[PDB]
A paper describes a structure:
DyPs (dye-decolorizing peroxidases) (EC 1.11.1.19) represent a new family of haem peroxidases widespread in bacteria, archaea, fungi and other micro-organisms. In spite of the obvious similarity between the two domains, only the C-terminal domain harbours a haem cofactor.
Moreover, most of the variants show crystal structures largely superimposable with that of WT DyP, except for the mutated residues. Aromatic residues were changed to serine in the simple W377S, Y147S and Y337S variants (the latter with low refolding yield). The proof for Trp-377 being involved in the mixed protein radical was provided by the W377S variant. In contrast, similar Tyr-337 and Tyr-147 variants (and the double Y147F/Y337F variant) only slightly affected substrate oxidation, and did not remove the high-turnover site.
Numbering used by the authors: 3 to 448
Write the structure that this text describes.
């Protein structure tokens, strides 16, 4: 059964701190690094168990993950059973129709050996912990780059940079989570390596870990806002209200979190806020043909692309349980400054902001990589639709820098196509393995 005492907390619970830092490092002098990995890091790595109880939530929550080259730097030559991980994300970039030539140079290679995730309610507390780490490891650890992140302020807390409530939908792990209405229920082995029904044999020390897919995804917020206003469908309501409808059609939820499948023409903030109701849908509606009806939610909507529910078969009434093996746990958090007055006024981005995207899964080919390549970037996914050309995911869909053709967004005519510029720009990332806690002071320090 699932030993959550040994699983790093960000995988199944999330850090849920106001501030987060992703500290990307290289390893020098591995013998020294190992001594301090065991003495300074292992004892303060936060587990799922620790983070699940308010009384044992640490002032500073810390998780750590290693790239393939990081594991090799530690002398670990075992096959973790994931080719995508082994090759690194840079080599996978072409799978998503982007080029590493546009990436942050540090990501465009395999020099990064790991990431330390620090999380606390102030940046000062994070900085203290970083200083402590640098002090004790000394030059055996080398900071290559970092990314600071934060829960957004005020009423936007929990929302991402475009303004949409985030973190609503996660797979429920059978035997661990108490499933919510509409929530998918999956074997632990979909997310945790070596757990129930993970078909891939793993090294013994790796049982209880997960692969971490990190993506630095810049969001062009003023451009997005202006696009919605310019293309707002006609109707009663303010221009902004109509623009909001278009945005909700693109995401699959209103900014409040209310799923459009359950409220297609108007927002419902109370619904959005209620975990017992805001996920209780399958995309099926009696009296409507699933293959052609986009009046409730477009086939191209972001959440419909990333969790198709009834589009891939299964129960038409909640909960739909299709494609469990293609589930990911998300622990993303926004980064960069809020949109400034001048940027909003000019409808133009000057400073970089976006999502520090984090997905956990036991198989990269089934999770993040599949959702990006086979769904989001695929004009003919989901399958079996009429028209067959769904178009691309308007939020994350990519086609080598070109505007994306996205169909079904306009309620007045499902055959109407929009050509949408990219609102999300990849600056690259890396694939890591978050080991079980026992491996940190154990195998990895040996
Ligand atoms: C800046 C980029 C992104 C933004 C702004 C964004 C935004 C959102 C929002 C607002 C939601 C709805 C809230 C929720 O259901 O929890 C969502 C859901 C989701 N997103 Fe994204 N996301 C981004 C990147 C990605 C990427 C790259 C992937 C995978 C390749 C992804 C996969 C998912 C999944 C699996 C869900 C939940 C779907 C469900 O269970 O119904 N997201 N995202």
């Amino acid at each position: 059964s699932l030993n959550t005492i040994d699983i790093q907390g960000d995988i199944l619970v999330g850090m849920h701190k106001q501030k987060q830092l992703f500290y990307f490092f290289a390893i020098n002098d591995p013998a020294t690094f190992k001594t301090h990995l065991a003495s300074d890091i292992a004892p303060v790595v936060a587990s799922v168990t620790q983070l699940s109880n308010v009384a044992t939530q640490p002032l500073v929550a810390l998780n750590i993950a290693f790239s393939n080259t990081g594991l090799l730097a530690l002398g670990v030559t075992d096959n973790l059973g994931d080719s995508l991980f082994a090759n690194g994300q840079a080599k996978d970039a072409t799978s998503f129709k982007e080029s590493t030539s546009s990436w942050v140079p540090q990501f465009a290679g395999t020099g990064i050996h790991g990431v330390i995730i620090l999380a606390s309610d102030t940046t000062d507390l994070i900085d203290q912990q970083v200083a402590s780490i640098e002090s004790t490891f000394g030059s055996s650890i080398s900071k290559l780059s970092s990314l600071s992140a934060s829960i957004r302020p005020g009423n936007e807390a929990g929302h991402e940079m475009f303004g949409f409530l985030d973190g609503i939908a996660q797979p429920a792990i059978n035997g661990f989570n108490t499933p919510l209405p509409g929530q998918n229920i999956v074997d632990a082995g979909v997310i945790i390596t070596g757990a129930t029904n993970d078909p891939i044999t793993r090294p013994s020390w790796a049982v209880g870990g997960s692969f971490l897919a990190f993506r630095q995804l810049e969001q062009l917020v003023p451009e997005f806002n202006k696009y919605l206003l310019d293309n707002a469908p006609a109707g009663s309501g303010s221009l902004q209200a109509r623009a909001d409808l278009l945005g909700a059609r693109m995401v699959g939820r209103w900014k409040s979190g209310a799923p459009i499948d359950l409220t297609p023409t108007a927002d419902d903030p109370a619904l959005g806020a209620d975990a017992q109701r805001n996920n209780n849908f399958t995309y099926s509606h009696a009296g409507f043909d699933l293959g052609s009806d986009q009046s409730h939610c477009p086939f191209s909507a972001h959440i419909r692309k990333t969790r198709p529910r009834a589009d891939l078969g299964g129960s038409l009434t909640p909960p739909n349980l299709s494609a469990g093996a293609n589930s990911i746990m998300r622990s993303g958090i926004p980064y960069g400054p809020e949109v400034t007055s001048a940027e909003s006024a000019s409808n133009t981005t000057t400073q970089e902001r976006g999502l520090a995207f984090v997905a956990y899964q036991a198989q990269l080919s089934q999770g993040f990589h599949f959702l990006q390549q086979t769904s989001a970037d695929n004009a003919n996914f989901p399958p079996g639709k009429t028209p067959a050309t769904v178009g691309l995911d308007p939020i994350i869909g990519q086609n080598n820098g070109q505007p994306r053709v996205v169909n079904g967004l306009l309620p007045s005519n499902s055959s109407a196509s929009l050509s949408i510029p990219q609102f999300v720009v990849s600056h690259g990332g890396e694939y890591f393995f978050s080991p079980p806690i026992s491996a940190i002071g154990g195998r990895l320090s040996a």
